[PDB]
Amino acid sequence: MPKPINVRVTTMDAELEFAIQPNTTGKQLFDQVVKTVGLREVWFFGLQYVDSKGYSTWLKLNKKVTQQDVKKENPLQFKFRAKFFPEDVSEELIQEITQRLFFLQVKEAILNDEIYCPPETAVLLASYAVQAKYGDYNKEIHKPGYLANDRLLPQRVLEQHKLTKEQWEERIQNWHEEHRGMLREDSMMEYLKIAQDLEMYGVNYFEIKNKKGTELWLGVDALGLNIYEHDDKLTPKIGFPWSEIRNISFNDKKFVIKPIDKKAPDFVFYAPRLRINKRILALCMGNHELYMRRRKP
Ligand SMILES: O=P(O)(O)O[C@@H]1[C@H](O)[C@H](O)[C@@H](OP(=O)(O)O)[C@H](OP(=O)(O)O)[C@H]1O
């Protein structure tokens, strides 16, 4: 009689562990996590893991987690993260819990430079993050240098020799002071409001190439498909909202965008490995279904 498998699921700010059955499905496991967290806006999330070959991967709901080549470790390692992003944080993130998990994930991303962010904006962001952690600024508790141990800015901004840490840190203090009567909840939501407008926010980039053989970037967001030149991942060269796409399919390393736009050329591009296009497709499918449920429903 088969022994249970140990699994470790980690949210941005929590450690969860379960004892799964040899025949448990990704869906049943997802069900457990969500029920345990009390998350309701489930359509945004999913479970992430690394496969035996080393790649990061999204867990398939409709299968036995045991049949998904997830790198064998004692407690199996899983990461609960947001897979899809809303079009407007304010209208779609209702639960206080969902709001927090998005703030925590987006912040990390900013902090790692995964999402470009102008220095002055970065400081402005950092200030809300502290109002959320340290509450209101009290001159007696929050003595100067109360942040010198915090990770607040990306390493990219600190490289601004125009100022120094303590300088940058007091810049943030100014903005912290200005946020006095602000709730924790509200501050995290302002952070999200400011970050959702950043060009690189919510877009999944993929290294691609066209007929010509030229390097190109492919972005999949909640709103459609964007093709970026190489030196610029902020501003698209050609776009394709979900309401402008008639059909998208891939051949081996062949991707065809069929535009609803009756008298417009099909856009075609080639992606490196096959398992890549496989995932690019899954995202398109997802952001598309989420795009519809926002209108037609
Ligand atoms: O029939 P199953 O048990 O789902 O078997 C396949 C498995 O779930 C893959 O992970 C999935 O790729 P995605 O990650 O792109 O879903 C593939 O989809 P496909 O058949 O549409 O390639 C499925 O066929």
Side chain identity, residue 110 = I
CATH number for the domain that contains residue 9: 3.10.20.90
In the reported structure, the alpha carbon of residue 282 is separated from the centroid of ligand 1 by a whole-number distance in angstroms of: 9
DSSP secondary structure, 123-174, as one string: HHHHHHHHHHHS-S--TTTS-TTSSTTS--S-HHHHT-TTS-HHHHHHHHHH
62 annotated ligand-binding residue: yes
Do 218 and 237 share a domain, yes or no? yes
Q: Is residue 297 part of a domain?
A: no
In angstroms, rounded to a whole number, what is the distance separating the alpha carbons of residues 287 and 167? 42
* Counted domains in the chain: 3
Sheet hosting strand 255-259, strand order edge to edge: 245-250, 255-259, 267-269
Please report the beta strands in 160-287, taking only residues with DSSP state E, as ranges in sequence order. 204-209, 215-221, 224-228, 238-241, 245-250, 255-259, 267-269
8 A C-beta contact, residue 172 and residue 133: no
142: containing domain: 83-199
Measure 176 CA to ligand 1 centroid, in angstroms: 48
Tell me the β-bridge partners of 204.
220
Is 296 inside any structural domain?
no
Q: Which atom of ligand 1 is nearest to the CA of 67?
A: 3
Give the whole-angstrom CA distance, residue 273 versus residue 191.
37
d(CA 167, CA 178): 17
Residue 278 lies inside a defined structural domain of this protein: yes
What determination technique applies here? X-ray
Distance from C-alpha of 232 to C-alpha of 276, rounded to nearest angstrom? 22
Q: Domain for residue 274, yes or no? A: yes
Contact 116/233 with Cβ under 8 angstroms? yes
